[PDB]
Symmetry: D2
């Protein structure tokens, strides 16, 4: 009699919460570790093209995961290891080389997504796609087109992280914990993003109401400088460290939690926005979405000034400007 059979009388013998991370660069692995440690998944699948490096990240993560609610953790160049994923996070992309045009970068990303997205869909046809790759508003559009998925199951990391950053500085200024502050940053991810002053409050007391010169240039307190420092903060990280990993990792884990645990929470994420704010093109921008187990179940219809509406409309034009030139 074997030792197994002497010790254990056995009576009995598919994952329900599988997550795939595509790309195991800094960002991919930051997503992966941040998702493990929120115990969101019973199976975690890693996919990249450098095979020896992929298997090492899988093994290192496996070994650490022994100190958690350990899920199944698998990896491969072949997308068959991503089968029956509830959620697939795309981090894979090309980084812009110096003197490369915006349009040229997007097209190289498009040519990559033309290999990735059809393989993801082949093996996980009812998954939600969460797009992290930059520039995120266009690459969400790209993944939507290639996948043929409905708009609810294609989401971009969007302004989730920029909004968190905004609320931190909002908090520092009012002497209030960031989580007690509310306020969104919507539209095109980075630089062109719109701080929405109308809906910024603490405990439902509107800041616009108390200080009606809030967003404006004749603002004694200069709250414009907040949205400026949010965007500078993104760059100062890259200047000092070389890249950002942790910040996007946890921002994505936050979005993954809302989807995987069906929290029906509000995130300013890139979604198909044709119909709203007088935009007639198939562009994606960040507006507040309820995220649940079926992805974006609802949008929250934010009332924007004509200034705010124009700044979005201008972003939607720039974005369609590139999208119409892309070859699928």
């Amino acid at each position: 009699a074997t030792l197994k059979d002497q010790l254990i009388y056995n009576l009995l013998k598919t994952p329900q919460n599988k997550i795939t991370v595509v790309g195991v660069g800094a960002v991919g692995m930051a997503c992966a570790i941040s998702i493990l440690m929120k115990d969101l998944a019973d199976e975690l699948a890693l996919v990249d093209v450098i095979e020896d490096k992929l298997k090492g990240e899988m093994m290192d993560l496996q070994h650490g995961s022994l100190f958690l609610r350990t899920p199944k953790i698998v990896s491969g160049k072949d997308y068959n290891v991503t089968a029956n994923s509830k959620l697939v996070i795309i981090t894979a992309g090309a980084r812009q080389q110096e003197g490369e045009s915006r349009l040229n970068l997007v097209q190289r990303n498009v040519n990559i997504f033309k290999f990735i997205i059809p393989n993801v869909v082949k093996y996980s046809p009812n998954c939600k796609l969460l797009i992290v790759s930059n520039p995120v508003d266009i690459l969400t559009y790209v993944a939507w087109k290639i996948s043929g998925f409905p708009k609810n199951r294609v989401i971009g990391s969007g302004c989730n992280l920029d909004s968190a950053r905004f609320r931190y500085l909002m908090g520092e200024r009012l002497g209030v914990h960031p989580l007690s502050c509310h306020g969104w940053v919507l539209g095109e991810h980075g630089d062109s993003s719109v701080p929405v002053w109308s809906g910024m409050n603490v405990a439902g007391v509107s800041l616009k109401t108390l200080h009606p010169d809030l967003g404006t240039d004749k603002d004694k307190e200069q709250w414009k400088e907040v949205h400026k420092q949010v965007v500078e903060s993104a760059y100062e990280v890259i200047k000092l460290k070389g890249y950002t990993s942790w910040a996007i990792g946890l921002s994505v884990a936050d979005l993954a939690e809302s989807i995987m645990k069906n929290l029906r929470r509000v995130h300013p994420v890139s979604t198909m926005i044709k119909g709203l704010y007088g935009i007639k093109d198939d562009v994606f921008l960040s507006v507040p979405c309820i995220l649940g187990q079926n992805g974006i179940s609802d949008l929250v219809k934010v009332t924007l000034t004509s200034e705010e509406e124009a700044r979005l409309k201008k972003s939607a034009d720039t974005l369609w400007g590139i999208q119409k030139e892309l070859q699928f």
Copy 2:
């Protein structure tokens, strides 16, 4: 009247669970992110010598921490930012250059710790020191000597991770969840480490009792191959990826949780072992320790065979062999 003063009537105006990570290489930051995400600390302090890279890791971690129970997160070249740390994790070290002697490497690590440890102690005199730097059993001794701390407040990452790995394979073989398996790997971290077959059980049913030829060469099932595959697993990670980060990060977070939340849990960690197993020298090896808010409160006196006892004794000799030559 400012917007802050119009909105908020204030009534009121030191951290109790501060953790310092020394070194923000792969391992340091894996420790840091893994500690953030277990919400162990109200203040987290990062210290390294490359100033621009340090500040970037701090900022990136800060930004991500907006999606957690956000602690204070600070960084500096100067150790004054580590003041009143309950726990300090040392990851800083020298890596062995080509043709460099084992003794010479340890002495360079000694000369580094002669700058680090006195600065750590100056600013956090009642802290626990958790040593992760390799070779860990000697560098724990080094930190103990330089700090003049009692043996309870100086701990090495030790065989915590190797034991977890062992128990995983133990589990796979018995068809039992790793956390339902018990069994230690003690002594010198890596290669020379001793699987303790006497104390390996499931639900208190000793495996040694059911299959008395367990550890031996005449073992039909060849359980020796388990401890072999544990050590090969460490290397296969380094061959494939370049280094290990995640696995030690979470292994250290596990030890930090036991200390910071006073769990009084048992970990096989490097501690001063003079008195036991006929060892008369001031050497550190991994034996089961109860970890709590005062560090190592208790040892568990494991009864070892003459083989096991000799393999430890031999490691203690090798280690004192280097320790006696070091210049403080």
Copy 3:
């Protein structure tokens, strides 16, 4: 040599997060179990006057706590077991007998607090007092007077639970998760409580803005019926079951979490409100407070209509009407 000494080599030999629950009725024990299971306390102290019943609730709770992060759990008629409590929850009360006057009931509660509060203070002088006993806005005042504590360390359960209930129905009506809805119920706990329509939003989009006839009687959708159903819900529980336990238990655990884990979260809790809304008497009502490790660190100055302000002012009069008649 004993078995303890053969097995365990000992190296070493005060709680930092002690909570006392005063009163082990339905409500007290609901508080206690709800606080245990959020692992908020390293020591839990139970105090009541029926000694045999007290010790049984302690033992039953002890035995269950073996399946949690087990704290120390103690009990006594003598308040010396409450020493060094960070938080003391008063649930002790008299229940109104048939034909007893409202004033007479409050005075019996006062005569009880005249024994409890000085004993609590004697043994835990830097604690926060959380008052749950009804009528809660007056008994918070009573505990404030007897304790001589500053207004920041004396808090009443207040409208925390009523506001939660409101937001649930708000959610059901908008097809939004309760936690994505914001909106307070302020003032005198129950019946006289004021739904604050100005500050009710989803994702910062004010409901008042979209539907300016919200609070009013000429409201097509009849949102007044929400605050009505909140108050009826309190009664329908007592009619059907005899009392409420679970609801106040978890409402108090929520407030305890904010204090014990220093979350600096906003709760509509009873606090000293002289200075605000043209109120010159020492009365307590529910306004939004930031709760942290020092109790109420901040108030949020909510802008109220003249109707809302008058309804509060009227409650403050009624309450001072009773407070001035009480004998200390």
Copy 4:
């Protein structure tokens, strides 16, 4: 246009982790609150026969659940509200009247289960049955027979709580945290239960090995007194308080966690034991079981002395003694 439609643009429109508690007495509700607070279930169903009291417990629990990851919470006299339960906890039964025979009580419990179990099965045919009702080892058998479920999907609360209690006192004696102690109490729940000395260890160091006169009468340290104090502790709760609620609540929540979150953890729970310890009858006793999402997946074959084996065998006889007389 409604306020809902002005605020929310909707895109989209069954529970996967439903738990039913049958009986909302002290024990039932302690189970319910303890299960809510471990966030195990997306739907919780309460069933009892007193309709007005049932609806009050549901409402009180509903209101408290607003401070958690709020599940759906329903109740009814009709079992149709228990449809698609992954786990059903039976607390309903009869208490022994004065001068009533043991056999007569069990038969009245049988006649109740003949209404409950077929209704549970009708609406949740693939559920796991967790039996809490006393006497638990017989009523588990009763539920197994009536349900026609396989032995893996019928589990009794068993000696889970007695074993926890044992380990606490074991810990107090060795100066070790209860969770660092291992040791089972197996067999018939209460009084006749067998402390298994062979498999009692700390960190895999067997206590039997260090002190071979452990269980015996010639034990200088008198460890027999531990199992005595475990059983006296059960009674002293009932003498002092009237009943036990919290202890069984959390003991059941522990078992529910292992099943609902597929932890594959070891619990000494009542299961069909024909085949083991020379027992040829269909009796249920507590032996170590791996609990997962399909209930009892595996048993751990504990080696027992002839004394231990005889004490179980004697319990199995007494139990079959009653079981053979029951009318289905």
